[PDB]
Amino acid sequence: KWDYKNHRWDKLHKDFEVCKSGKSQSPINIEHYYHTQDKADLQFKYAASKPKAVFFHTLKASFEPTNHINYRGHDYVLDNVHFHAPMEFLINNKTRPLSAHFVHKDAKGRLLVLAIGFEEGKENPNLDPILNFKEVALDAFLPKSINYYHFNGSLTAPPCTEGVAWFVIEEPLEVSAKQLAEIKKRMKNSPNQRPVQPDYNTVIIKSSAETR
Amino acid sequence: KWDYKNKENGPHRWDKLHKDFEVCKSGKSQSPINIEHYYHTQDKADLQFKYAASKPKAVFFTHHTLKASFEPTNHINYRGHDYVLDNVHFHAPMEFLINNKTRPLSAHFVHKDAKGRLLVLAIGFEEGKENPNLDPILEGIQNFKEVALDAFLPKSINYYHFNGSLTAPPCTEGVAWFVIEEPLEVSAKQLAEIKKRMKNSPNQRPVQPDYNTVIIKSSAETR
Ligand SMILES: CCOc1ccc2nc(S(N)(=O)=O)sc2c1
């Protein structure tokens, strides 16, 4: 059984062999990239939303097909949000104590994932509805203006399927220290961060968008 | 047994011939593709060429292409990492399609660095003027005369850069592609001969599935 306990994922199932063999496995440290000033091309179609279900090695909140992201002429339906502690993706070796992943699928079956860091500070109201289920302020969840990193990668969890479009947001969200240990407690006080995977000089663009 | 013919050994079946080749199917950054969506970028000038005229170690037909091997004298520098041009080979038509445009021919500059990491540079050809750069080879397949590598490429190039795979089995990924937009020119006769030297047998992998590849457009000076 696969866990984060103390590189052998490929062994447990042959379905997981790509975890080693893939040349574009995630997460990574974002250190070399291209600046661009091209249109967002990223449109959010988010609303405050109450979960299809809320359940637990990571804390996950799933949703109905109500929230969308449209990228270069294709609609990606929001499936779920889950957390990693520490932040899996590194930005020039800076990681945040917590992260969230927003998972999407298009007509063609393609995957798009949204990642953002958290900053230890003020209480974050967006977390509480989940922590009948209370609705989550998605369209308000995200920063107004985001600087993001976009590149190609894999699932950070098995089967580590690749073909994932990652957009990693620069801005850290804020989380209070009680909330942090609580979710950390919520995840059995067991870390669920895959280490940085081998990076074969991934082509990375830095760009921005308006989430709302 | 892989080939480009429509029988059991074509591209739609390359994954079946050897288990070493399955990434041809399962791989998620498979090349070639149609380059139409990309990001325009600051021209930080990432790529530096260091080519000289060079005589081929060998010029020979292998695995459907005309290949010219070289001593490790011609190089490319990318973000402070140097890749040695290993060989130049040909595909007809051009395999990468640029904004849905297909060219009669392309040339691939295969580079490998110390780590065994791969870099390939592609430039297309369309029918026109006689190319003196080409002729050493068409005769050389039949010592070898040197190739004006330093003179081969356009002075300033527009190219697309992304991560992809090899276009022939084993279809290895982690390949850094530099696809130059500018077409070089070839005479209609030279064109017909290259195809004859490459046996009038197509050696173009079809466009492969695209998983939203991040492509940047930039430019450089080859001279
Ligand atoms: C039905 C199985 O769905 C799975 C399994 C692993 C997995 N990892 C992500 S992530 N952390 O965004 O890269 S999403 C996902 C979905």
Ligand SMILES: CCOc1ccc2nc(S(N)(=O)=O)sc2c1
């Ligand atoms: C080890 C044998 O060398 C091989 C096998 C396939 C292959 N495809 C290219 S290409 N068409 O530039 O992407 S180069 C190359 C070298």
Ligand SMILES: [Cl-]
């Ligand atoms: Cl993350």
Ligand SMILES: [Cl-]
């Ligand atoms: Cl090509």
Ligand SMILES: [Zn+2]
């Ligand atoms: Zn995740």
Ligand SMILES: [Zn+2]
């Ligand atoms: Zn080739």
